[PDB]
């Protein structure tokens, strides 16, 4: 069974998801079996109060490309119980991508996938362009 999963606390926790990135954000909930599930997206520069539970696990991605994002400067967010009527903030931001990953993002945004192998670049980069970011491989790396 996967180690990265939400705890079934059944204890409500109100969280403000703050999109402090220029990307449309996809919140991803890791369920009780450690499987990722998509939730409604957040436009850039918007904050929204949402209803979750203590010990639940969340990660955040670019909704269109699945590029990884940070939450409170780390990969995973776990709501805690609210104290003195205060919401918990999940501040979502861009990571400092490596230059290579940022270049791959830009090339993927400009060239259709069937045309990657027509680019005048070293062949090893075709596999890198095709190896699109995905939650499954990131969970494996984090585990």
């Amino acid at each position: 069974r996967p180690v990265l999963r939400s705890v079934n606390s059944r204890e409500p926790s109100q969280v403000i998801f703050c999109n402090r990135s220029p990307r449309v954000v996809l919140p991803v909930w890791l369920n009780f079996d450690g499987e990722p599930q998509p939730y409604p997206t957040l436009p850039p520069g918007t904050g929204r109060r949402i209803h979750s539970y203590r010990g639940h696990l969340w990660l955040f991605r670019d909704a269109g490309t699945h590029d990884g994002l940070l939450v409170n400067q780390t990969e995973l967010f776990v709501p805690s119980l609210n104290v003195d009527g205060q919401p918990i903030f999940a501040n979502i931001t861009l990571p400092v991508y490596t230059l290579k990953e940022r270049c791959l993002q830009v090339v993927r945004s400009l060239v259709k996938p069937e045309n990657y192998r027509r680019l005048d670049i070293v062949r090893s980069l075709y596999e890198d362009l095709e190896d699109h970011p995905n939650v499954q491989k990131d969970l494996e790396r984090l585990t």
Partner: peptide, 13 residues
């Protein structure tokens, strides 16, 4: 973009 990607791949950064 393509030349920068080649440089980043070579430079490992």
């Amino acid at each position: 973009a393509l030349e920068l990607l080649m440089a980043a791949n070579f430079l490992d950064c």
